[PDB]
Amino acid sequence: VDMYIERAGDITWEKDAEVTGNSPRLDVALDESGDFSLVE
Amino acid sequence: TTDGVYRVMTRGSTQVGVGVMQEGVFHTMWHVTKGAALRSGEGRLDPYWGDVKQDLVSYCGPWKLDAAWDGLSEVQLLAVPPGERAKNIQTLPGIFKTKDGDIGAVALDYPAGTSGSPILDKSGRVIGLYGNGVVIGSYVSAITQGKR
Numbered sequence A: 001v002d003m004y005i006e007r008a009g010d011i012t013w014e015k016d017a018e019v020t021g022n023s024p025r026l027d028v029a030l031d032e033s034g035d036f037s038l039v040e
Numbered sequence B: 001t002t003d004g005v006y007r008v009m010t011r012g013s014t015q016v017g018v019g020v021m022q023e024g025v026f027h028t029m030w031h032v033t034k035g036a037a038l039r040s041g042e043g044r045l046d047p048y049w050g051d052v053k054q055d056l057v058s059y060c061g062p063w064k065l066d067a068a069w070d071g072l073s074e075v076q077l078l079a080v081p082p083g084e085r086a087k088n089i090q091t092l093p094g095i096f097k098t099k100d101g102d103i104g105a106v107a108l109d110y111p112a113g114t115s116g117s118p119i120l121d122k123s124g125r126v127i128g129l130y131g132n133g134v135v136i137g138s139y140v141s142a143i144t145q146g147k148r
Protein backbone atom coordinates (compact mmCIF):
# COMPACT_ATOMS: atom_id res chain seq x y z
CA VAL A 1 0.00 0.00 0.00
CA ASP A 2 1.61 3.20 -1.29
CA MET A 3 0.87 5.90 1.31
CA TYR A 4 2.21 9.29 0.13
CA ILE A 5 1.84 13.04 0.79
CA GLU A 6 1.02 16.02 -1.43
CA ARG A 7 1.33 19.66 -0.37
CA ALA A 8 -2.02 21.44 -0.26
CA GLY A 9 -1.20 24.88 1.12
CA ASP A 10 0.40 27.27 3.57
CA ILE A 11 -0.70 27.30 7.20
CA THR A 12 -2.32 30.72 7.47
CA TRP A 13 -5.26 32.44 9.09
CA GLU A 14 -7.73 33.80 6.50
CA LYS A 15 -9.62 37.02 7.33
CA ASP A 16 -12.44 36.07 4.92
CA ALA A 17 -13.16 32.61 6.31
CA GLU A 18 -16.66 31.19 6.52
CA VAL A 19 -17.79 31.12 10.15
CA THR A 20 -19.97 28.35 11.54
CA GLY A 21 -20.54 25.78 14.24
CA ASN A 22 -21.66 25.84 17.86
CA SER A 23 -19.62 25.52 21.09
CA PRO A 24 -20.93 22.61 23.15
CA ARG A 25 -19.69 21.83 26.66
CA LEU A 26 -19.50 18.05 27.04
CA ASP A 27 -18.37 15.75 29.82
CA VAL A 28 -16.16 13.10 28.22
CA ALA A 29 -13.76 10.34 29.16
CA LEU A 30 -10.74 9.19 27.15
CA ASP A 31 -9.91 5.49 27.24
CA GLU A 32 -6.71 3.65 26.60
CA SER A 33 -7.44 3.18 22.88
CA GLY A 34 -7.69 6.93 22.36
CA ASP A 35 -11.51 6.80 22.15
CA PHE A 36 -13.56 9.60 23.64
CA SER A 37 -16.93 8.73 25.08
CA LEU A 38 -19.66 10.76 26.73
CA VAL A 39 -20.01 10.69 30.52
CA GLU A 40 -22.98 11.56 32.71
CA THR B 1 9.91 18.95 3.38
CA THR B 2 8.43 22.41 2.87
CA ASP B 3 6.32 23.78 5.69
CA GLY B 4 2.63 23.44 4.98
CA VAL B 5 -0.52 21.38 5.17
CA TYR B 6 -0.43 18.12 3.17
CA ARG B 7 -2.88 15.49 1.97
CA VAL B 8 -2.19 11.91 3.04
CA MET B 9 -3.03 9.65 0.08
CA THR B 10 -3.12 5.92 -0.43
CA ARG B 11 -3.05 3.63 -3.43
CA GLY B 12 -6.98 4.52 -7.92
CA SER B 13 -6.00 6.94 -5.15
CA THR B 14 -7.92 7.93 -2.04
CA GLN B 15 -7.30 10.65 0.54
CA VAL B 16 -7.15 9.11 4.01
CA GLY B 17 -6.11 12.21 5.94
CA VAL B 18 -4.12 15.39 6.31
CA GLY B 19 -1.03 16.50 8.16
CA VAL B 20 1.27 19.37 9.02
CA MET B 21 4.91 19.83 8.04
CA GLN B 22 6.75 22.13 10.43
CA GLU B 23 10.46 22.32 11.27
CA GLY B 24 11.18 19.30 9.10
CA VAL B 25 8.71 17.06 10.96
CA PHE B 26 5.43 15.70 9.61
CA HIS B 27 2.57 15.65 12.10
CA THR B 28 -0.68 13.70 11.69
CA MET B 29 -3.12 11.49 13.56
CA TRP B 30 -2.26 7.90 14.41
CA HIS B 31 -5.59 6.60 13.06
CA VAL B 32 -4.73 8.09 9.65
CA THR B 33 -1.47 6.24 9.04
CA LYS B 34 -1.17 3.69 11.88
CA GLY B 35 2.48 4.71 11.90
CA ALA B 36 3.27 3.44 8.40
CA ALA B 37 6.11 5.05 6.50
CA LEU B 38 5.12 7.78 4.05
CA ARG B 39 6.38 8.64 0.60
CA SER B 40 7.09 12.26 -0.32
CA GLY B 41 8.07 12.44 -3.96
CA GLU B 42 11.12 10.24 -4.28
CA GLY B 43 11.87 10.48 -0.54
CA ARG B 44 10.65 8.41 2.39
CA LEU B 45 9.44 9.69 5.77
CA ASP B 46 9.87 7.29 8.67
CA PRO B 47 7.91 7.39 11.93
CA TYR B 48 9.69 8.85 14.94
CA TRP B 49 7.14 9.08 17.76
CA GLY B 50 3.58 7.86 18.10
CA ASP B 51 0.89 7.38 20.71
CA VAL B 52 -2.47 5.63 20.28
CA LYS B 53 -4.10 7.28 23.28
CA GLN B 54 -3.29 10.79 22.06
CA ASP B 55 -4.00 9.56 18.51
CA LEU B 56 -0.90 11.32 17.20
CA VAL B 57 2.24 10.46 15.24
CA SER B 58 5.29 12.39 14.06
CA TYR B 59 7.70 11.59 11.25
CA CYS B 60 11.39 12.50 10.88
CA GLY B 61 11.71 13.99 14.36
CA PRO B 62 9.84 14.76 17.57
CA TRP B 63 6.48 16.51 17.78
CA LYS B 64 7.03 20.24 17.22
CA LEU B 65 3.60 21.81 17.66
CA ASP B 66 2.98 23.31 21.07
CA ALA B 67 0.56 26.26 20.83
CA ALA B 68 -2.72 25.88 22.75
CA TRP B 69 -6.22 27.32 22.54
CA ASP B 70 -6.59 30.33 24.86
CA GLY B 71 -10.07 29.19 25.95
CA LEU B 72 -11.83 32.38 24.78
CA SER B 73 -11.06 33.19 21.15
CA GLU B 74 -12.31 31.88 17.86
CA VAL B 75 -10.02 29.54 15.93
CA GLN B 76 -9.86 28.35 12.33
CA LEU B 77 -9.98 24.80 11.03
CA LEU B 78 -7.71 24.71 7.96
CA ALA B 79 -9.75 21.92 6.42
CA VAL B 80 -8.31 20.00 3.47
CA PRO B 81 -11.22 17.85 2.33
CA PRO B 82 -10.77 15.17 -0.33
CA GLY B 83 -11.07 16.74 -3.78
CA GLU B 84 -11.23 20.30 -2.41
CA ARG B 85 -8.85 23.21 -2.10
CA ALA B 86 -7.56 23.91 1.41
CA LYS B 87 -10.11 26.16 3.11
CA ASN B 88 -10.46 27.95 6.43
CA ILE B 89 -13.50 27.48 8.67
CA GLN B 90 -13.69 29.85 11.65
CA THR B 91 -15.50 28.78 14.83
CA LEU B 92 -15.66 29.26 18.59
CA PRO B 93 -14.63 25.94 20.22
CA GLY B 94 -16.70 24.29 22.88
CA ILE B 95 -15.08 22.23 25.64
CA PHE B 96 -14.44 18.57 26.40
CA LYS B 97 -14.49 18.47 30.23
CA THR B 98 -12.37 15.54 31.43
CA LYS B 99 -11.07 14.27 34.75
CA ASP B 100 -7.63 15.42 33.57
CA GLY B 101 -8.68 18.93 32.51
CA ASP B 102 -10.49 20.72 29.72
CA ILE B 103 -9.75 20.36 25.99
CA GLY B 104 -11.05 22.65 23.27
CA ALA B 105 -13.43 21.00 20.83
CA VAL B 106 -14.85 22.06 17.47
CA ALA B 107 -18.39 21.16 16.42
CA LEU B 108 -17.53 20.78 12.76
CA ASP B 109 -18.30 17.68 10.70
CA TYR B 110 -16.14 17.17 7.56
CA PRO B 111 -15.36 13.98 5.59
CA ALA B 112 -13.10 11.41 7.28
CA GLY B 113 -10.24 12.13 4.87
CA THR B 114 -10.02 15.55 6.54
CA SER B 115 -8.64 13.95 9.72
CA GLY B 116 -5.31 15.54 10.60
CA SER B 117 -6.27 18.98 9.37
CA PRO B 118 -4.72 21.70 11.54
CA ILE B 119 -6.66 24.01 13.83
CA LEU B 120 -5.11 27.48 14.07
CA ASP B 121 -5.13 30.41 16.46
CA LYS B 122 -5.30 34.02 15.33
CA SER B 123 -1.51 34.16 15.03
CA GLY B 124 -1.47 31.26 12.56
CA ARG B 125 0.01 28.76 15.05
CA VAL B 126 -1.27 25.16 14.99
CA ILE B 127 -3.11 24.55 18.31
CA GLY B 128 -4.00 20.98 17.41
CA LEU B 129 -5.32 18.55 14.82
CA TYR B 130 -8.88 17.72 13.75
CA GLY B 131 -10.38 14.25 13.69
CA ASN B 132 -10.59 12.52 17.09
CA GLY B 133 -13.87 13.15 18.86
CA VAL B 134 -17.34 12.09 19.94
CA VAL B 135 -20.91 12.19 18.64
CA ILE B 136 -23.72 14.06 20.40
CA GLY B 137 -26.00 12.98 15.38
CA SER B 138 -23.39 15.73 15.25
CA TYR B 139 -19.69 14.99 15.44
CA VAL B 140 -17.49 17.12 17.71
CA SER B 141 -13.69 16.94 17.36
CA ALA B 142 -11.22 17.45 20.14
CA ILE B 143 -8.49 19.98 19.40
CA THR B 144 -5.76 17.35 19.77
CA GLN B 145 -2.31 18.74 20.57
CA GLY B 146 0.89 16.89 21.38
CA LYS B 147 3.79 17.71 23.65
CA ARG B 148 6.99 19.43 22.54
Ligand SMILES: NC(=O)[C@@H](O)Cc1ccccc1
Pocket (backbone or CB within 6 Å): B034, B035, B036, B037, B047, B048, B049, B050, B051, B057
Ligand atom coordinates in the same frame (compact mmCIF):
# COMPACT_ATOMS: atom_id res chain seq x y z
N1 LIG C 1 4.07 1.00 11.07
C1 LIG C 1 5.31 0.75 11.46
O1 LIG C 1 6.08 0.01 10.84
C2 LIG C 1 5.80 1.42 12.75
O2 LIG C 1 6.74 2.44 12.45
C3 LIG C 1 4.62 2.00 13.53
C4 LIG C 1 5.00 2.83 14.74
C5 LIG C 1 4.93 2.28 16.01
C6 LIG C 1 5.08 3.07 17.13
C7 LIG C 1 5.31 4.42 17.00
C8 LIG C 1 5.38 4.98 15.75
C9 LIG C 1 5.22 4.19 14.62
